């Protein structure tokens, strides 16, 4: 149930960002960080490390959202 | 045990940032976001919403770390 809640949220945000990353462009470091935590969330999700899996999806989203906010990233 | 793992990590990162926020200065929006998710992590942690509690601590840290990286925030 806590396992259920973390799995559902991780997958939800991970499926969203795998699409979202494709819609934005900009600073290559920001973009590399994004893919780096996307890869890591995917990897931990698969082997069942749910806390690290969720932790990496939130970092991926923060680099993405904050990148957009400060104009290091732009929608295509 | 998953409850244990989320509680331990949330508290650990929350006690660290409550100190850390005091050591840095800069852009007031960045700083307001930081305190806003610190407040929210504290609130969810207390009522037992562990996933949202952890989720807010990671956002608080990302605004802080990324703020430092892009030089919107500085160590005092």
Description:
2 copies of one chain form a homodimer. Chain A is mainly alpha-helical and 76 residues long. Chain A has a single domain (1-76), classed as AF1782-like (Substrate Binding Domain Of Dnak, Chain:A, Domain 2). Chain A has helices spanning 2-20, 28-47, 50-69, and strands spanning 24-26, 73-75. In chain A, α1 (2-20) packs parallel to α3. The longest helix of chain A is centred in the middle third of the chain and has 20 residues, at 28-47. The termini of chain A are far apart.
CATH topology of chain A: Substrate Binding Domain Of Dnak, Chain:A, Domain 2
Sheet-strand content of chain A, in percent, reads 5-15%
- Within CATH, the superfamily of chain A carries the name AF1782-like
Shape of chain A: elongated
How many domains would you count in the coordinates of chain A?
1
- Our Rg estimate of chain A from Cα atoms comes to 12 Å
Structural classification of chain A: mainly alpha
The largest sheet of chain A, given as strand count, sense and whether it forms a barrel, is: 2 strands, antiparallel
What is the terminal separation of chain A in angstroms?
38 Å
Strand tally of chain A = 2
**Major β-sheet strand ordering of chain A:** 1-2
Helix proportion of residues of chain A, in percent?
Answer: over 70%
Protein name (chains A, B): DUF357 domain-containing protein
Pfam family, one (chains A, B): DUF357
